[PDB]
Amino acid sequence: QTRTYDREGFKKRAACLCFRSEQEDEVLLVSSSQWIVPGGGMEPEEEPGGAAVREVYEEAGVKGKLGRLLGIFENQDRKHRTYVYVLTVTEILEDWERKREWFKVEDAIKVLQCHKPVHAEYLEKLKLGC
Amino acid sequence: TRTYDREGFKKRAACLCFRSEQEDEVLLVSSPDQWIVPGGGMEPEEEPGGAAVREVYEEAGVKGKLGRLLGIFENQDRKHRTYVYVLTVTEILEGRKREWFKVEDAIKVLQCHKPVHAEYLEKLKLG
Numbered sequence: 218q219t220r221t222y223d224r225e226g227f228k229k230r231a232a233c234l235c236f237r238s239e240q241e242d243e244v245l246l247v248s249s250s251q252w253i254v255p256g257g258g259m260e261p262e263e264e265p266g267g268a269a270v271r272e273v274y275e276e277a278g279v280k281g282k283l284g285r286l287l288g289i290f291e292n293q294d295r296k297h298r299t300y301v302y303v304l305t306v307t308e309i310l311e312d313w314e315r316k317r318e319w320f321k322v323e324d325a326i327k328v329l330q331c332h333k334p335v336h337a338e339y340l341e342k343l344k345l346g347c
Numbered sequence: 348t349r350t351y352d353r354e355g356f357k358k359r360a361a362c363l364c365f366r367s368e369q370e371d372e373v374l375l376v377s378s379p380d381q382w383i384v385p386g387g388g389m390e391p392e393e394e395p396g397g398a399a400v401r402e403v404y405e406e407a408g409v410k411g412k413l414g415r416l417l418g419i420f421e422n423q424d425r426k427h428r429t430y431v432y433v434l435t436v437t438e439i440l441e442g443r444k445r446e447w448f449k450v451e452d453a454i455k456v457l458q459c460h461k462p463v464h465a466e467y468l469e470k471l472k473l474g
Contacts, residue, residue, distance in 0.1 A: 328472065345454055345472055346451040
């Protein structure tokens with residue numbers, strides 16, 4: 218068993234907003250399978266922060282310093298609950314065995330609003346508190 | 348008087364007035380127990396920066412140092428084009444009200460009574 222659920226039947230997930238610097242102006246996005254924020258399911262014994270760190274490693278090939286919990290984002294169309302963290306990137310990796318690019322925050326929201334608006338919401342709440 | 352561009356839009360100017368160079372607290376004023384960003388029409392010979400400074404004096408009774416042009420905001424529901432500047436307040440003068448809001452609270456309170464003004468602050472923070 219590698220997936221985990223809460224008592225209301227939502228799948229538990231974790232994601233990170235990965236920034237180039239502590240000024241949080243450039244965020245790293247990646248290709249889907251269109252751009253997305255890196256993230257995925259929590260495993261049965263993982264804490265959310267652990268899931269987040271593992272997922273950005275596996276999906277974006279980065280390592281960094283885990284920061285604050287932005288919030289728990291509920292997707293009711295998909296029955297998801299996602300713990301979204303901020304992280305400051307320190308290392309990018311190899312060639313793997315999918316693209317990655319930095320977007321200015323305003324630019325990231327624009328491209329995400331096309332086909333993946335819930336990811337755009339992460340960034341909006343971060344900057345605006347919506 | 349009022350002034351217009353070649354596409355028929357009315358020309359306006361407004362300013363986001365901040366307590367410090369940190370741009371964390373913004374000044375709002377009453378219209379109504381309603382809060383708004385100070386602004387109004389440009390006069391026929393004015394440059395946009397001049398209109399902005401005159402408007403914050405007339406509408407919020409402050410003087411300060413004019414900063415950057417945030418952008419030109421086009422309102423098509425009203426056929427407006429508004430030059431929105433930031434300004435750092437240096438002197439205040441004394442039933443219209445004025446109060447400082449943390450930017451996050453300002454966005455929330457404006458989104459209820461004046462959502463086009465809320466966009467001014469939103470674009471500031473996303474930038």
